[PDB]
Amino acid sequence: DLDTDNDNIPDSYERNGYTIKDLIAVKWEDSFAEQGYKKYVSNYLESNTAGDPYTDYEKASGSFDKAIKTEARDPLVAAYPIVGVGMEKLIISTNEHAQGKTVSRATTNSKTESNTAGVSVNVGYQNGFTANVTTNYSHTTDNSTAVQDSNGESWNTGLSINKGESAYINANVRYYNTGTAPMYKVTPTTNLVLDGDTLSTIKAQENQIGNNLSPGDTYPKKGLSPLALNTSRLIPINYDQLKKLDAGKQIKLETTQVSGNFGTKNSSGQIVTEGNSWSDYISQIDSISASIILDTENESYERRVTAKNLQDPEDKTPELTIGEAIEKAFGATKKDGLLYFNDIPIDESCVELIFDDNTANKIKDSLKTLSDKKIYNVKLERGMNILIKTPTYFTNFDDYNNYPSTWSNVNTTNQDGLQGSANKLNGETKIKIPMSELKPYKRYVFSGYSKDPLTSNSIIVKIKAKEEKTDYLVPEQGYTKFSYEFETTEKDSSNIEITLIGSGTTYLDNLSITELNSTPEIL
Amino acid sequence: DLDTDNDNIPDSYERNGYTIKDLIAVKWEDSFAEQGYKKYVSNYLESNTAGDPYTDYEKASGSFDKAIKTEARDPLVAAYPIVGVGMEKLIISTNEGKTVSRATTNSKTESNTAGVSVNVGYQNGFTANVTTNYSHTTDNSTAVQDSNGESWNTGLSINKGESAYINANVRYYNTGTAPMYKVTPTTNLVLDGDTLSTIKAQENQIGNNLSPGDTYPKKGLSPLALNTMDQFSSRLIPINYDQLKKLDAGKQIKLETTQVSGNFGTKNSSGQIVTEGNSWSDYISQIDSISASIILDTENESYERRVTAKNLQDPEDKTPELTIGEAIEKAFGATKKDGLLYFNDIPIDESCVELIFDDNTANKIKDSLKTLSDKKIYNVKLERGMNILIKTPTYFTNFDDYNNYPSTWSNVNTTNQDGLQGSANKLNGETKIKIPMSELKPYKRYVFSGYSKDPNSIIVKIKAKEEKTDYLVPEQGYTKFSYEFETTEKDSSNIEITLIGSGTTYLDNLSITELNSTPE
Ligand SMILES: [Ca+2]
Ligand SMILES: [Ca+2]
Ligand SMILES: [Ca+2]
Ligand SMILES: [Ca+2]
Ligand SMILES: [Ca+2]
Ligand SMILES: [Ca+2]
């Protein structure tokens, strides 16, 4: 009944109930939950709940641009375009025109690789902190290129460079967008950085790309030829970074400044993109909201959710926990105590959580007074960065099981697990997962949960690879988390074996294998 | 409720303390401290107490652009941006070819503490240091890194009459409480007074906005090289043989940004943000000649604020006067508990950190300290034209809950209550501390400060690049003492501090701060 800002939704509805249907607003009474209606929250002193250029009525009723992802319909999630720059194939040639000695290798681009290259796990996690801290944090704008089809051969042999001259560097690139917003006049600037030595900056301009970049869409639309860097000239190199590229180091490719417009619906007809720009609302959006990155093993996402400053009594904004922020940002079906993706069971004990130092200190300070000892029941504060890594393989001895092979000596007729059922242990437990299902020259982490209701009934684990190891683990009365690294080798090697021997009392649950980063191959 | 200046705040509420809740202004009742509210005071003749474009109510109610810091919420602190430039790498080639590449570290406040002079024993209640040359956070100084004694011309076969070329890596930062929309720097480059070449950059080549605390090369990214410049695309900065021989000696490259320009954000009826008609040109001249400057330097970050103050000899202005401590608490996000100020966890006080004034205001502080009876420098009034710098120690102990040293002090007992603040040490025997060079920066200048009392002789011994032993007789009260030393490179020995007393003496608040960088 009371209106304050320039929105049709009243003051009494802008807290504790938000339903919008047939372009009018009605409250929430938990009765139309499964008819496609949801409940939101917003402020009451500002027209825009975030820094986006849409009002809270204009973004929670569908009366805005149709190209925006539907997860940004919630007023606590801001539309934000993030353009990243990807590499596919590296071509080196020794001519300045476009014959000569040329080599060409096939690479894969990794998005969240420099973020999690400074993560080292412990054998046991003290207190209830079930997450690790990274040395540095980077968003999904930079990429690291890993060469796969590379036998033992130097780059200098294929070019025959003696003292002072060198060859030229050409590449194949693509232009991805991972966020809940499109751009229209896309003009990105990107450094091609080799460990601090900026070789060149590529600017795509306008006519080489087109007048659109839809969210979740590259410029080569799925199955198409990649964009080579010839259509605005070649990139040179010298004979001091060739052995630097040869021995251990990899080419980083990072965008720095990205310019573009946005579309607003006019009075009469379709959208316009002339008098708008995504360069002014970026500073407004980034100074109020947090930053959550989700890394599914086939695609990546990154969102900004507005938070609450707890050292302010005047500030009236909604406050969220970590799990509610994840559910509102990425979209998650709420199963019985669980958060679900389309097929991925994200939770606090089924993924890997990465924070930087300030976020880790804030969470470790806040977890002392919590009465439930879980990460997801932590209040959100403005200015933290969270990374979620979905493991490649994960089983919980339940309806979800996607390991390439099957285990041995597994009994599932029990119910005293962390999430429902568990695995009774009697003797040995073996798994021989082959190298053909594993990416070569990487680093992997095997993580799991253990529980034994006895005094000193321990277990031994053993990981067999090129760098094999054996470990001894003692459990406790409660559920304890263990993590162990191993490193892989090229595709012409043996299988990866994981063995563990118990003593007939211990219980295990939530066994997962995830990837961390790439190791340098000796060349 | 009579209103002389139109800002929808009554003059009776504006003269005393007042606060804002539920988007209305109410008086101060001295009971909102535990809830989280704060008190404000503003002039009643002018709608804008400071020279900022925002009015009193808009600044004091948080209705401005949300990109500024929340420490500019009070109307007595201006909100204007102070951008700066730092330099992180050096590449020299003789090509218009050999190439030499080295790494450098930048310091924001290094010309501020270049000319300070330390002394043993402070013969007043002043307990502070006086500098000769004052430089803000806009100026910055760069220092070279590990070269193993190699000459800078042994890789470049250049004789007299030829010119080498400078290629550098530049990182742009902000240290204020305002975003800098449409930034355009016009920075310089000086070596022993000689401007080699100015450096000019435009809006649409670096980040168009600079939010206040962010960086144009983002954290985890790479610095912006000057080879990726429009005007530095075919020529570089020339260098003669005399200039490179000066750099080979004890000299360093400093960078000072002279003048910047751009707009600021506002609010619109139809849209939200426009940054065209506004400008940060005619407002900086109002801010810089009406207020006083405070600089804080914590071990990872520096801040610079400007706080408006009452003029002395002119009754005609009614700006609210402040003490030094209240202005320090208002300028930064400082929380006061038990009579002590804490910024976030690092303490700031008159006896805990090293505070430096310039030469013009130290006489004013010393003359105002004679009339005061508390004999503390955090109680003197603030006038127009004071310059304060605060340096927090890297290592500091008070024999209490706060400790930062990487090695435990030997022979320490804190079961007393007769100290200056909290518990204190008793030197029944002698205290010793070893500290390794891996925990310290190489080729720097450090000072070590503390407080001693004897209700006897105290012999101090510092092992450094020059070992120094000295004697000090303490008085019945408390006197601040300090001793300077210098360090050596990374692969040298450790650093020893030994303090031997007489049995009936007390020590408190032992700190080590960094001042300068010695030339190699
Ligand atoms: Ca409303
Ligand atoms: Ca509203
Ligand atoms: Ca289970
Ligand atoms: Ca006023
Ligand atoms: Ca007024
Ligand atoms: Ca003390």
Residue numbers in the entry:
A (entry chain A): 218 to 315, 319 to 451, 457 to 748
B (entry chain B): 218 to 313, 320 to 678, 682 to 746
What does the report in the manuscript say about this coordinate set?
CDT is a member of the Iota family of protein toxins which also consists of two homologous toxins produced by Clostridium perfringens (the Iota toxin) and Clostridium spiroforme (C. spiroforme Transferase, CST). All three Iota toxin family members are assembled from two polypeptide chains termed the “A” subunit (CDTa, Ia, and CSTa) and “B”, subunit (CDTb, Ib, and CSTb). All three B subunits are presumed to contain five domains that are involved in regulation (D1), oligomerization (D2 and D3), and host recognition (D3’ and D4). Once proteolyzed, the mature form of CDTb forms a large heptameric, soluble structure referred to as the prepore which binds one molecule of CDTa to generate the toxic moiety, CDT.
Further classification and refinement of the CDTb dimer led to a map with a final resolution of 3.56 Å, with local resolutions consistent throughout much of the map (S3A). Modeling of the CDTb dimer resulted in the assignment of two chains that we call ‘Chain A’ and ‘Chain B’, both of which were observed in a prepore-like configuration with three additional nodes of density that we modeled as calcium ions in agreement with previous studies. The modeled portions of the two chains are nearly identical in structure with a low backbone RMSD (0.945 Å), though differences in the residues that could be modeled do exist. The receptor binding domain (D4) was not observed in either chain in contrast to previous structures though additional density is present, indicating the D4 domain remains flexible during toxin assembly. Chains A and B are arranged in positions and orientations that are similar to that observed in the prepore structure, though Chain B is rotated ~40° about the central pseudosymmetric axis in the dimeric intermediate, as opposed to ~51° in the structure of the prepore, illustrating structural plasticity at the dimeric interface during assembly. The surface formed between Chains A and B accounts for ~1,200 Å2 of buried surface area and relies primarily on structures formed by residues 411–423, 477–484, 504–513, and 534–541 from Chain A and residues 237–240, 278–290, 427–434, 439–451, and 490–498 from Chain B for assembly. All residues contained within this interface are also observed in the structure of the symmetric heptamer, reconstructed from the same dataset. One site of interaction comprised of structures formed by residues 384–388 and 456–463 of Chain A and residues 314–318 and 451–454 of Chain B was observed in the previously defined structure of the CDTb prepore but is not found to interface in the oligomeric intermediate suggesting it is only engaged in the fully formed toxin.
